[PDB]
Design a protein around this nucleic acid. Structure first.
Lengths: 247, 203, 53, 89, 200
RNA sequence: ACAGCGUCGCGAGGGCCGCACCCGGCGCUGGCGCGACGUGAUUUCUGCCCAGUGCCACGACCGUCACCGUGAAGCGAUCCGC
RNA sequence: CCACGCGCCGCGGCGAGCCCGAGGGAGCCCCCGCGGCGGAGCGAGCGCGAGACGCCCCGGGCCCGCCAUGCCCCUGCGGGCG
RNA sequence: CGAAGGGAGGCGCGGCCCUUCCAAGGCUAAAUACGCCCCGGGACCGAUAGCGGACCAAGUAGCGCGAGCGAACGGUGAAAA
RNA sequence: GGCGGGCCUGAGGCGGCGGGGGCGACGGGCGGAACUUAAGCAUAUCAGUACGCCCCGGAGGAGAAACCAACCGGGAUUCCCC
C-alpha cells in the first residue's frame, strides 16, 4: 500500500499552516499584579484582519506596568469594540464589552469570549467568529464557574480564569454560500493545503482503504473502531449513530 | 580501616538511612546534566577498589543512562526480511547500561582514558554510573609506575574496544572454561580459527 | 581479474546477446568476453607438493 | 560413570590436601556487621519473614525467602538468622 | 553417483569470496622454520652460558589413557623445591621453572621431581664473581630440552605361580563381575525389600 | 474537482496524524474550529428493513477471559484452587 | 579446471602393523619426528566379548554380543553348563 | 528481586558428601596475523593475454545533474644516416 | 537586613600540555541483511557473513584459573598438528 493523505499530513511539509503575513498570536493580556488587584486601562489603537482568521483582531495598547514604555496586545475583537475605546483588564473591571475580568466576577448569563481554560492560559475557548460562551453558575466554595462552551458542552473552569465580555465579531460569516470553487481556493490559501479534496472511493486501492473496484463503493462499513490503526481510521470514527434523523 | 564499615553500609541499600540519602542524591542527579564532572568520587570506597587514587590527573565523571530495552531503528516500525528478524520493541540491549555509560563519557572526553565505572544511583527511567578517567599526559600519572600503563597508546579508547570490565562482561570474558571456549581471543577470532581451511603444503 | 568492471546483462529484447554488458554495451564478465574473468580462474590452493613415504 | 573400573586403584600414596584450617569470617568482620545493623536495621523482606516466623511458621517464610532471594540454601540461611530476632520478641 | 556411498561429513565452504579469509596457505612453511631458527640462534647468542630452556618437571600425562607415561610440565611445586632447599626466586635465577599453582597429588611425584632437581643442581655451574671471559667462553650452551623426560620401554619380569595364586580369589572373573554389579544388585535388593513390605 | 448537501469524531489532563528515539504537524489553531468521510448546483423528493456484518453504549457484568497477587499440598522443582 | 569429502578400481613401499603431522636438527630432494587409522566385535545402555573346521569361492556347521528359556553352583539379580 | 562464605564438576529439583577453584578490580613479553611501500624469486601471462591501466601525461580521454562509470593506443633502423 | 573569612559547589578568563582527521590489509567493539540451501516455504541455512558505524597498534586481542578433570592427574594466554 501507500501512506494515505492523513499520514502524509502529519509531517507538515506542504500541509503546514500558511502562517506568513499573520498579525501574531491573538491572546488575552498576561495576568499581572495590577490585573489581579485593580484594572489596567488600554486603548484600541486599531481593528485589523488576520490572514487565516475570519474574526477581526484588535491592537489594544496598555501602559507598561513593569517599566516606562507602552505594551501592545493582540486580542480577538468582540463585536462593537471601536478604535479609541478604553478597555480595562482587571479584577476590578466594569462589565462593558471588551473588558477582561475573572469569570467569578462576571455575572451569570453574560456572553463571554476568549475564555481561559485554566487561569493564566492567556486565551483558549470561544475564539472563532460569532462564537461565545455563557456563564452558567459559580460555586463559590469550589472557586469554580460552570460555562457552556459554544458546542453546548458544560465545562467547570476556575473562577480565576479570565474572559473578554462580548460575542466575537465576524458573526454570520458561513451564512453566505462560497458559490464558486474559486472562492474556496482563496479561503484555503490563507489557511493550509487541505483543498481540493479527492474522495477515497475515487483513489486506487493503494492510496486509500475505501480504494477502488469496478464500481466506486466503500466496500466494508464506513464506521471504524476508535482503536483502529493510524492508517486505517478513514471513515466515521467511533460513530455512536449514523444517518439523518429528527432532532 | 573506615572503609570496611562503608562497604557494609552499602550492602544494606534498602535501609531507611540509605534510602533517604539515595532519594536526595537521585532527585539532585535528575536536576543536573547527563555527563557531569564530579569533583570527588561520591563513593570513595568503591572508587578506591576500582583503582581511583586522589592524585592530580585522576578525574570522576557521572554519566546518566536511560533505563529500558532497545527499540530497533527501522523506519515506520517495519524490518522487511525473513519473519525471525521482524521485531522492533522487545529487543534487550547487548551491552549493559554500565558499559553504555562508559562509552558515552568516552565520546564526550576523547582526550582522557577510562579506568572503570561504579553505580551511584537509579530511578524508574534513569540509572547513574560514575566513571574514573585518567589524563595520560599529566606528569603525576606519567611518572607513576602504578598508573603509567594507561599512558601507553594501546590503551586509547578502551571502552570503544570493550576492554573495560563492563565491556569484557558483555563479551563473556568474565567466564573461563566450559561455555567460554568459543569466546577467548574474541568470538570472531575463534570463528575464524575454527572455520579456517588449512591447506598445508603436504596434504 | 575481470570482475572490477560493473557489468549487468542488457537482457532479452534489445537484439543483442544476453551476456553481461557495461554502460556502452561492451561485453564483460565472461570467458568469451574481452576483459572477462577466466571461466575457472587458476588458484594458489592447488596442491603443488606431492607426498612420498 | 566417571571413574574407570580398576579394583586396585591407589598404587601410590596420596598427598592429603584439604581443610587448610577451614575458617569463619573473623570477629572483626562480625563487629563491623553489628555496628552497621544498629544504624541500618532490617530490610523490608527480612521484616516480612520475621512476621511469618512469629506466626505462619516456616513454609510461608521459606517460600517468601526463596522468592525474595534465589537459592534454597541462602533462603534457609536467612530464615535461620532471622529466627533469633523473632523468637526473642 | 549413488550406489553405496558413505555420506560426507564435510561442511560447506563459508566466506569463500567475501569475508574474514578462511584459507591458510602453507607456502610460508620453509621460511617460517628459517625465521624461527634465527630467532632461537640470536636469543641463544644473547645468553651464551645459559640454556634457552629452563628445567621443567616430570609430570604424569593426564587421563587413564596415558597414566603410566611422563611428560614435561610447566614448573616445580614449592614442596619439590623444599626438598632441594631452594626458594622460588633462587630456583628461577638458576633456571628451574617454578609453578606455585601445581599441587603434588602423590608422594611419588615429589620424589621423582626432587631427584630431577638434584641432577640439575649438580649439572648447573654458576658463573659468578667477575666474568672470567675465557671460562665463560669455554662454557657450552645446552641446546634443546634440559634432561628430556624418557618413558622407559616395558620389560617382562619373573614371578612364582604360587605367590600369585594367594593374591587372587579362585574364579577371579566372578569376583570382578560381583564388583561391577554390586551397586545394581543392592538397589534391586532394596527395591525387592519394599515390594515385600507391600504384603504387610 | 467543484459549490451545495449530509454524516462522524473531538473542550486541549483532548482529537487526528507524524515518529528509532529525543521530540513534532494541524496550531500565530479553539466547535461560524480542526481532523475524518460519503454524495455532488438548482427544482422536487429521499420509502421500508438493525436479521447478517460494522459501529456505539457512567449498558450491564451473564458466561468466558491473563500475568500478578493470594490460599492449600509438596523435599523442592512444582501442582491445584481462588 | 582446481580444492575438499565419499565410493570403487589399478599401482608402489611396508606388513599386524603402518604413517615427509606439527615441528626440530648452523639442517630445508637429507636426518629425526605424535596423534590417527588398522589390529574385535556387539548392545539403548549396565556392559559383555569370538577358534571348529578351510588352497580359493559359495554354503553348512560352530563360537561372540544382543533377546528368551531350563539346569547346576562359589566370592550370588553373580559364575558355570546347555 | 536481591545474598554470605561462595563457584564449578557437559540432565533439572531437594538432601548429604567428595574432588577442585575463589567471580563481581587491574597489568603483562614471546610464539601468531597482515595490505600499502621496499626487496628477492617463479614449470606464471606475453599486448583481445597479464592489473581497468607495458605506450613520458590510466583512474587518463570520454560519459553521467550526481553517487558513479570508464576506454583505446607496444615494436623504423645497427646508426636518423 | 547588610559586612568580611573558612569549607563546598559552580562561573569567566589566562598559561602549559593533550584530543580531533587520514590508511581498499591485519586487529578489537557494536548495529546487521538478503540472494541462497532446504529441490516449495515460515524454524533452520546462508551468516554470529556482506555492508553501516566506532576504536587502536605495530601487531591487536587474549592472558597468570571463582580452570580442566576424575588419573599411578594436570596447571596463565596465544598459535599449529590431531
Amino acid at each position: 500500500g501507500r501512506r494515505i493523505r492523513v499520514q502524509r499530513k502529519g509531517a507538515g511539509s506542504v500541509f503546514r499552516a500558511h502562517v506568513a503575513r499573520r498579525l501574531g498570536a491573538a491572546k488575552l493580556r498576561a495576568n499581572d499584579f495590577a490585573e489581579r488587584t485593580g484594572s489596567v486601562r488600554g486603548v484600541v489603537k486599531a481593528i485589523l484582519h488576520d490572514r487565516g482568521r475570519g474574526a477581526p483582531l484588535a491592537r489594544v495598547q496598555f501602559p507598561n506596568m513593569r517599566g516606562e514604555g507602552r505594551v501592545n496586545e493582540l486580542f480577538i475583537a468582540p463585536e462593537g469594540m471601536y478604535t479609541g475605546q478604553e478597555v480595562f483588564s482587571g479584577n476590578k473591571a466594569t462589565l462593558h464589552i471588551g473588558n477582561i475580568l475573572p469569570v467569578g466576577n462576571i455575572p451569570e448569563g453574560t456572553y463571554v469570549c476568549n475564555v481561559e481554560e485554566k487561569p493564566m492560559d492567556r486565551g483558549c475557548l470561544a475564539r472563532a467568529s460569532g462564537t461565545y460562551c455563557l456563564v452558567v453558575a459559580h460555586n463559590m466554595e469550589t472557586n469554580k464557574t460552570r460555562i457552556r462552551l459554544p458546542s453546548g458542552q458544560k465545562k467547570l473552569i476556575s473562577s480565576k480564569a479570565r474572559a473578554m465580555i462580548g460575542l466575537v465579531a465576524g458573526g454570520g460569516r458561513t451564512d453566505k454560500p462560497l458559490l464558486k470553487a474559486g472562492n474556496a481556493y482563496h479561503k484555503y490559501k490563507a489557511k493550509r493545503n487541505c483543498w481540493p479534496v479527492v474522495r477515497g472511493v475515487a483513489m486506487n486501492p493503494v492510496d486509500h482503504p475505501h480504494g477502488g473496484g469496478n464500481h466506486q463503493h466503500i466496500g466494508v462499513s464506513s464506521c471504524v473502531p476508535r482503536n483502529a490503526v493510524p492508517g486505517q481510521k478513514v471513515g466515521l470514527i467511533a460513530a455512536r449513530r449514523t444517518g439523518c434523523s429528527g432532532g | 580501616g573506615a572503609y570496611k564499615y562503608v562497604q557494609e553500609l552499602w550492602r544494606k541499600k534498602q535501609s531507611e538511612a540509605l534510602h533517604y540519602l539515595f532519594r536526595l542524591r537521585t532527585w539532585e542527579y535528575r536536576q543536573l546534566n547527563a555527563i557531569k564532572r564530579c569533583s570527588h568520587p561520591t563513593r570513595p570506597e568503591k572508587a578506591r577498589r576500582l583503582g581511583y587514587k586522589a592524585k592530580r590527573g585522576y578525574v570522576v565523571y557521572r554519566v546518566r543512562v536511560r533505563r529500558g530495552g532497545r527499540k530497533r531503528q527501522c523506519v515506520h516500525g517495519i524490518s522487511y526480511g525473513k519473519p525471525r528478524n521482524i521485531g522492533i520493541v522487545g529487543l534487550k540491549p547487548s551491552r549493559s547500561l554500565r558499559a553504555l555509560a562508559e562509552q558515552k563519557v568516552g565520546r564526550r572526553l576523547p582526550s582522557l582514558r577510562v579506568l572503570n565505572s561504579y553505580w551511584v544511583a537509579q530511578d524508574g527511567s534513569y540509572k547513574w554510573y560514575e566513571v574514573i578517567l585518567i589524563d595520560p599526559f599529566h606528569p603525576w600519572i606519567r611518572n607513576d609506575p602504578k598508573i603509567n600503563w594507561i599512558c601507553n597508546p594501546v590503551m586509547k579508547r578502551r571502552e570503544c574496544r570493550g576492554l573495560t570490565s563492563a565491556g569484557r562482561k558483555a563479551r563473556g570474558l568474565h567466564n573461563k572454561g566450559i561455555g567460554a571456549m568459543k569466546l577467548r581471543p574474541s568470538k570472531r577470532a575463534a570463528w575464524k580459527r575454527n572455520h579456517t581451511r588449512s591447506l598445508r603444503r603436504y596434504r | 581479474a575481470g570482475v572490477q568492471c560493473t557489468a549487468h546483462s542488457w537482457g532479452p529484447g534489445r537484439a543483442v546477446a544476453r551476456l553481461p554488458r557495461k554502460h556502452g554495451g561492451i561485453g564483460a564478465y565472461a570467458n568469451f568476453a574481452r576483459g572477462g574473468h577466466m571461466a575457472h580462474p587458476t588458484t594458489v590452493i592447488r596442491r603443488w607438493c606431492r607426498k612420498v613415504n | 560413570p566417571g571413574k574407570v573400573f580398576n579394583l586396585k586403584k591407589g598404587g601410590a600414596v596420596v598427598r592429603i590436601v584439604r581443610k587448610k584450617e577451614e575458617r569463619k569470617t573473623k570477629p572483626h568482620q562480625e563487629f563491623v556487621k553489628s555496628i552497621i545493623q544498629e544504624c541500618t536495621g532490617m530490610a523490608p523482606y527480612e521484616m516480612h519473614i520475621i512476621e511469618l516466623l512469629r506466626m505462619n511458621k516456616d513454609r510461608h517464610a521459606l517460600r517468601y525467602a526463596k522468592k525474595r532471594l534465589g537459592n534454597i540454601k541462602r533462603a534457609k540461611a536467612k530464615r535461620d538468622q532471622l529466627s533469633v530476632y523473632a523468637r526473642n520478641i | 553417483m549413488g550406489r553405496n556411498v558413505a555420506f560426507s561429513n564435510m561442511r560447506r565452504y563459508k566466506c569463500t569470496n567475501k569475508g574474514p579469509n578462511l584459507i591458510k596457505n602453507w607456502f610460508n612453511q620453509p621460511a617460517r622454520k628459517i625465521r624461527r631458527r634465527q630467532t632461537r640462534l640470536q636469543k641463544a647468542k644473547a645468553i651464551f652460558p645459559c640454556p634457552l630452556q629452563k628445567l621443567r618437571p616430570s609430570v604424569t600425562r593426564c587421563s587413564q589413557k596415558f597414566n603410566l607415561t611422563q611428560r614435561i610440565g610447566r614448573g616445580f611445586t614449592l614442596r619439590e623445591l623444599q626438598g632441594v632447599g631452594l626458594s622460588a626466586g633462587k630456583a628461577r635465577q638458576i633456571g628451574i621453572a617454578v609453578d606455585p599453582r601445581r599441587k603434588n597429588k602423590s608422594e611419588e611425584s615429589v620424589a621423582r621431581n626432587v631427584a630431577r632437581l638434584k641432577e640439575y643442581l649438580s649439572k648447573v655451574t654458576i658463573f659468578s664473581k667477575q666474568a672470567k671471559p675465557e671460562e665463560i667462553q669455554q662454557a657450552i650452551q645446552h641446546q634443546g630440552v634440559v634432561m628430556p623426560v624418557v618413558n622407559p620401554k616395558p620389560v617382562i619380569t619373573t614371578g612364582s605361580i604360587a605367590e600369585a595364586k594367594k593374591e587372587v580369589p579362585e574364579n577371579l572373573f566372578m569376583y570382578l563381575r560381583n564388583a561391577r554389579t554390586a551397586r545394581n544388585r543392592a538397589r534391586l535388593a532394596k527395591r525387592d525389600a519394599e515390594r515385600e513390605a507391600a504384603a504387610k
